[PDB]
Each structure stands twice: as structure tokens, then as C-alpha cells.
Write a protein that binds this ligand. Structure first.
Ligand SMILES: Nc1nc2c(ncn2[C@@H]2O[C@H](COP(=O)(O)OP(=O)(O)OP(=O)(O)O)[C@@H](O)[C@H]2O)c(=O)[nH]1
Length: 685
């Protein structure tokens, strides 16, 4: 008799087993290289090896194939064997066959159609079992993305929230972000994002096959975000006016962006900048399975076309003149993902810097990486995918020329600057900052530092100076707040017996995170500054809200610049510092017992730090696990200079475990204020 079956279970169980439970919505989602349960139910009589012959087949792309490893067919048996696409009976009772499928550790990832045919006697029965998505497996020792520790698996693949470090090298700020990779519809969107990539358009079956490599998927996924022109998720913008969309600084996670992309026929979402590029990249990759973590670099030598020596030409005040010069990025962000690397000499497993921010290049404009981080540390520039570029980012040198008024350019000493400070990514499993500078560089003038600089043909720095034994730095005394007046100080130190009479040029300008300077918001110029011997001198500079408010950026960044001139020996000291102005905290109360499918309430508030009223006030809120939906509340009336603004959001968290709730506040005079609360959700009954 021809055997025929009632239904399939593809199961809930595997989700727990595969670390894809939240992801297992209407669909089955598993990670490659790992057995998964599948139970076949049958009408009347069960499967009998003494007659029934079940062979299984799976298919991925639009052009499946045996050679492209994007199709496979295999028989049911008792044990294992080879080829790695296997099916194996685990148990029978009544009319239900309980069995286990395994896919290889290098099967490509994507949507698969699982079909079953008999061959029971002579008469062939044949039909569609169901569908499942197969992903990378940080758990599968044989998979290329394997991590030894559960901790790091959890952090870099499973955790839907974290931190983007922003602010300033001397005051590191951690913006919270909802990566929400397992949020509904997001996996489906990440597939659409690869089924729409330039190479899938060229060949389709080639691309579908190449998605077994995390280097491919990484390079594709990253590139799709903003660069590559044509189709793409985000449109960049930088000039500081974002009225026709949402400003880059206004996003609290990468979910809405993705849905605004898909929900408007895959069109570039209005307005990202580098950290937004990364956070989205991080989401896509995590979703697919490549452990990825967003990284930030302070004083970043971006858009320098690999140049390891940047030079600047500056007037009698210290002001840069080259409108054909590129400024140093206060910070610039990218991501790192984890994979073995079979396409270069061995020993380069690990983190690879993928930078999805398009950079002007030795020919045109595009993305960067993957490149092993270790290579960048080692000086091994020849290592593939943009190693000279990531290297410049972290290792570029800077020469500051002041210009003497007969055509001559006199060299200045500038200690306040070193490219690639404070490289930051969230710790594993905690909210603390990990500092990863050491994975990129060796300490200055160490044995190993110069070993690496040789392999990069850098050298040419430093073991050098002009020595006048005067130093200068910029000091802030204490922290200062957006909306305040406050002072910063030029700090000169004279450690000799000479008494100099000096010129000192102090300048504060509003700036943006990538480096664009605005108008000055305070200046003090001194022409007979008396520095007495073996002494120190602090020169005050008043910076007024009334003076930075018009042009201040949502990054709340002000650059202080100072030039000390010794006229007798013609000596030039330069000191620069980027300040960050604090926003008010967002006070967040969590009301009720945090419980699964139980109403929760979030009380959210801040107090107005400006001396003028806030209008158009709005809070926004989201968090994977806490709401299925972004939530917003517009507060109708102005909030005056004194007072507070408070409102409640209703939440209905559908998942247990820890979740960051992330909140944005917006207003006419005060934008992109951020907040977060860690909420642990327990069980209902
Ligand atoms: N809001 C804000 N606070 C800052 C910033 N930089 C430093 N602070 C805080 O200001 C205080 C002084 O930090 P420092 O960098 O030591 O200040 P400084 O005036 O340079 O003094 P020295 O370190 O002694 O040279 C510390 O509490 C910092 O956390 C900033 O850019 N923005």
C-alpha cells in the first residue's frame, strides 16, 4: 500500500535547541551543522523500512543545484555516513515517525523548501513537507563562525540591545540601541536584503551558493547598508539639516529603519551617519548568525584615502585653511564580526573589521573589509579587503603647520592629538565599556609596535620634538551641561627659568561628530601673555549657551582650539579638545510587576535644562521583548524653563529575560536625548 500522512511538526523544541526560539515565529529556523527534530504523522499504518523508501530533498535559491551546494537529496537511514545532509529515524510509535535531520557546517544560509517523496513499492508518492530558514551556527564547532564560550555567543549573536559609544575621547558616552534582530519580520527582511543585492541580480544561483561563507554574507550585508548606491537601506546626510526625515541622531534602534526600508518598496531611509550604518549592519549580521559587535574609534582618520601622514595648514590663529583637507573624525564607528578565514594564510581567525561607511578610495567610493583585526595590528596591510584603510583609521599621523607671513610654514607641536584613541565596544554580558585599543595597536615605541610599522612601511614617526619645555593642554575642571554657560581653560606650563611674553589664541567652535566646524562660540586673544619662570598659567574662556545654541549639533560637541606663540625663538604649541555637553538624564520608573503577557507601564521624565521653553516635546520608546511596536507620546503644551515633563507608556512584553528599554526625547530646542532601563521580565501563570 502507498503510504500517506496527516500532518507535520517541525517543532517549538528546536528553537530552544537551536537558540532561535524568539525567531521561530510561523516558520522553522535552525542553525547549520546541527540535528533538528521533525515528526512525520501518518494516516493509518506507519513507515516500514521493509518496503517504504523515504528520500528527502532540500532547495534554497531560485536556481538550486547539487554542485552549488544549494540543493541536496538524501535517504532516510539508521546512523550517519557522509555528505552531511542526513536523515535518521530516532523513534516510532503509533502512526508517528520521529526523526532527525542534520545539515552540514557549511551549508549556505537562507530559506529552504523541505520536500518528501516515497518510492514505497513502484508507485511514487511525492510532496512538500514545509519550509525552514537555516542560519550560521556559533555553537557548531565545525562552523566557521564558532565561538568557544557561551557568554560570547550570547552577547554577540543573541542580545538584542547594547551600546554605541559616542561623545568624546575624554568623555565617552554610551548611546543605547535596540538591535532587535529577532523582532518580528526582521529575519524575512534580512533575506530580502540579500535577494536584492548587486551580485544576486547578476547571477542569483552563484550568490545563493556563496552564502555559506560568513565573509561573503558579511561583505554583502555590510555593503547593502548605505554604500553601493542603487538600492540601499539608509541615505546618509551630514550638513546638519534633516527636516525631510528623521535625523541620524534620532534613532533608538535598527528595527524601524529596516521596516521603513521594506515598507516603502526597499527605498533608502532618510538619514543615517556612520554609527547608524554599523548598528544596522550589526543587526543584519546578528540576525543571520555572524557574531558581530559595534565598535567606535576616537580621533578617526577617515576619508584619508589610506594616507598615513595628514598635514594641515593653519593661520596666525591656528585655523585650518585647506578646504581641500579632510578633518579628523571626533569619532567614527564600524563593526567587527567573527569567523575563520580560509582565503588567506592561516592564523587569521577572529574579529574582522567591516566598515559599512563608504570612504573615498584609491579609485572611487566604497565600503571596507572584512579584514582581520590582527592583520591591522600586525602591519600586514597586504591582507585582503582594505587593510591599508582600516590601518589609516587607527594609525595615521598628523602634522600641524602654522604659516609664517612670508610664505614659510613653521612646524607646531601638538600633544593633544593622537589618532585612534579609546576604541570601544560593550563588554560581554554587562553594561560596561570594553576598551579594545590593544587589539588594534601595540603600546607606543614597544618592540612589537615597530615590528608592525615595518610590515606596513609606516615608520617615519616619532622619537622627535623641538623641546621648548613649555606645554599646553585644555582643561574643563568639571562636567558641563547642554543649556549652560561654562568655562574651559587654556593650561600653559612653563618648566624653565626663562620668562616668555607670549601670544595665545583661544577659539571655540561648534563641530559635528565627523569633524565639520561651525561658527565660533567664544574667543579670547592675548598678545602680551606673561609666563613667569617655573610656573603654570590658566587662561579662562567663557562659552555661553546664547552663543553655541544656534549651530550646535545633536552630538553636543564643541571644539576648543588654542595656539601659544613664543616670538623670541618662534615656537608654536597647539592644543585642541572636543567637549561633550550633557543632556538631562531621562528618569524612568517601571510600574507593576514585570511579567510575561502582563501589562507593564513605563513612566518617563526629564527636567528642562535650557533657559527657554521646550515645544513640540515627544518621547519615543522601544525594546525587543518589551513592545512589538515603537511607541510615541506627544506632549501638547510647552515645557517652560523651570519645569519637568513626565508621561506614561503602556507596554506588553511578550518575552521573559533581560531587555533594555530604550527611550528618545525630541523637542524644538532640545533633540536626541537618550535613555535606557534594564527590565527583567518574569513568568506569568
Ligand atoms: N560634560 C562633560 N564632562 C567632561 C568632559 N570632559 C571631562 N569631563 C568631566 O570633567 C572632569 C574633568 O575631567 P578631566 O579631563 O580630568 O578634566 P581636566 O580639566 O582636563 O583636568 P586634567 O585631567 O587635570 O587635565 C571629569 O569629571 C570629567 O569626567 C566633557 O567633554 N564633557
Amino acid at each position: 500500500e502507498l503510504v500517506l500522512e496527516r500532518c507535520d511538526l517541525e517543532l517549538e523544541t528546536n528553537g530552544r535547541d537551536h537558540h532561535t526560539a524568539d525567531l521561530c515565529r510561523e516558520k522553522l529556523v535552525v542553525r547549520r551543522g546541527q540535528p533538528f527534530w521533525l515528526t512525520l504523522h501518518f494516516e493509518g499504518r506507519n513507515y516500514e523500512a521493509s518496503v517504504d523508501s523515504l528520500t528527502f530533498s532540500v532547495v534554497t535559491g531560485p536556481a538550486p543545484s547539487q554542485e552549488a551546494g544549494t540543493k541536496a537529496r538524501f535517504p532516510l537511514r539508521d546512523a550517519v555516513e557522509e555528505g552531511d545532509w542526513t536523515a535518521t529515524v530516532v523513534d516510532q510509535q503509533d502512526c508517528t515517525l520521529s526523526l532527525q535531520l542534520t545539515t552540514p557546517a557549511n551549508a549556505p544560509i537562507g530559506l529552504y523548501r523541505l520536500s518528501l517523496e516515497a518510492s514505497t513499492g513502484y508507485q511514487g508518492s511525492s510532496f512538500v513537507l514545509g519550509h525552514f530558514i537555516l542560519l550560521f551556527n556559533a555553537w557548531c564547532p565545525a562552523d566557521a563562525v564558532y565561538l568557544d564560550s557561551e557568554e560570547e555567543r550570547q552577547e554577540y549573536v543573541l542580545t538584542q540591545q547594547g551600546f554605541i559609544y559616542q561623545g568624546s575621547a575624554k568623555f565617552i558616552k554610551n548611546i543605547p540601541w535596540n538591535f532587535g534582530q529577532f523582532e518580528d519580520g526582521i529575519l524575512d527582511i534580512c533575506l530580502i536584503l540579500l535577494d536584492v543585492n548587486p551580485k544576486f541580480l547578476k547571477n542569483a544561483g552563484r550568490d545563493c551558493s556563496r552564502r555559506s561563507s560568513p565573509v561573503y554574507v558579511g561583505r554583502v550585508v555590510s555593503g547593502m547598508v548605505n554604500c553601493n548606491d542603487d538600492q540601499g537601506v539608509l541615505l546618509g546626510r551630514w550638513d546638519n539639516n534633516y527636516g525631510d526625515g528623521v535625523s541620524p541622531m534620532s534613532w533608538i534602534g535598527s528595527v524601524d529603519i529596516l521596516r521603513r526600508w521594506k515598507n516603502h518598496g526597499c527605498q533608502r531611509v532618510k538619514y543615517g551617519q556612520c554609527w547608524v550604518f554599523a548598528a544596522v549592519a550589526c543587526t543584519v549580521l546578528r540576525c543571520l548568525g555572524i557574531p558581530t559587535r559595534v565598535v567606535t574609534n576616537y580621533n578617526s582618520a577617515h576619508d584619508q584615502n589610506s594616507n598615513l601622514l595628514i598635514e594641515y595648514f593653519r593661520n596666525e590663529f591656528g585655523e585650518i585653511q585647506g578646504d581641500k583637507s579632510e578633518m579628523i573624525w571626533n569619532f567614527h564607528c564600524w563593526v567587527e564580526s567573527w569567523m575563520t578565514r580560509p582565503d588567506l594564510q592561516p592564523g587569521y581567525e577572529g574579529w574582522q573589521a567591516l566598515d559599512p561607511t563608504p570612504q573615498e578610495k584609491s579609485e572611487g567610493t566604497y565600503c571596507c573589509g572584512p579584514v582581520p583585526v590582527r592583520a591591522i595590528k600586525e602591519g600586514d596591510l597586504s591582507t585582503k579587503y582594505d587593510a591599508p584603510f582600516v590601518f589609516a583609521e587607527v594609525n595615521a599621523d598628523v602634522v600641524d603647520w602654522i604659516q609664517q607671513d612670508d610664505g614659510s610654514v613653521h612646524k607646531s607641536i601638538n600633544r593633544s592629538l593622537i589618532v585612534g584613541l579609546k576604541i570601544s565596544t560593550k563588554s560581554v554580558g554587562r553594561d560596561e565599556r570594553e576598551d579594545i585599543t590593544h587589539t588594534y595597536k601595540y603600546p607606543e615605541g614597544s618592540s612589537e609596535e615597530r615590528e608592525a610599522f615595518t610590515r606596513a612601511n609606516h615608520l617615519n614617526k616619532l622619537a622627535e620634538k623641538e623641546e621648548t619645555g613649555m606645554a599646553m593642554r585644555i582643561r574643563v575642571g568639571q562636567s558641563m551641561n547642554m543649556g549652560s554657560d561654562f568655562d574651559v581653560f587654556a593650561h600653559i606650563t612653563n618648566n624653565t627659568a626663562e620668562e616668555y611674553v607670549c601670544r595665545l589664541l583661544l577659539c571655540a567652535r561648534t563641530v559635528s561628530y565627523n569633524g565639520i566646524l561651525g561658527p565660533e562660540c567664544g574667543t579670547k586673544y592675548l598678545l602680551n601673555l606673561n609666563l613667569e619662570p617655573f610656573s603654570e598659567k590658566s587662561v579662562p574662556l567663557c562659552i555661553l549657551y546664547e552663543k553655541y545654541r544656534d549651530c550646535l549639533t545633536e552630538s553636543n560637541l564643541i571644539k576648543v582650539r588654542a595656539l601659544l606663540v613664543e616670538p623670541v625663538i618662534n615656537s608654536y604649541l597647539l592644543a585642541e579638545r572636543d567637549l561633550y555637553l550633557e543632556n538631562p538624564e531621562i528618569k524612568i520608573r517601571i510600574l507593576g510587576e514585570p511579567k510575561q503577557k502582563r501589562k507593564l507601564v513605563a513612566e518617563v521624565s526629564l527636567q528642562n535644562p535650557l533657559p527657554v521653553a521646550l515645544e513640540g516635546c515627544t518621547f519615543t520608546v522601544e525594546g525587543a521583548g518589551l513592545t512589538e511596536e515603537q511607541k510615541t507620546v506627544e506632549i501638547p503644551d510647552p515645557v517652560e524653563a523651570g519645569e519637568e515633563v513626565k508621561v506614561r507608556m503602556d507596554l506588553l512584553p511578550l518575552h521573559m529575560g533581560l531587555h533594555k528599554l530604550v527611550v528618545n526625547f525630541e523637542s524644538d530646542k532640545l533633540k536626541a536625548v537618550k535613555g535606557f532601563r534594564n527590565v527583567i521580565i518574569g513568568p506569568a501563570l
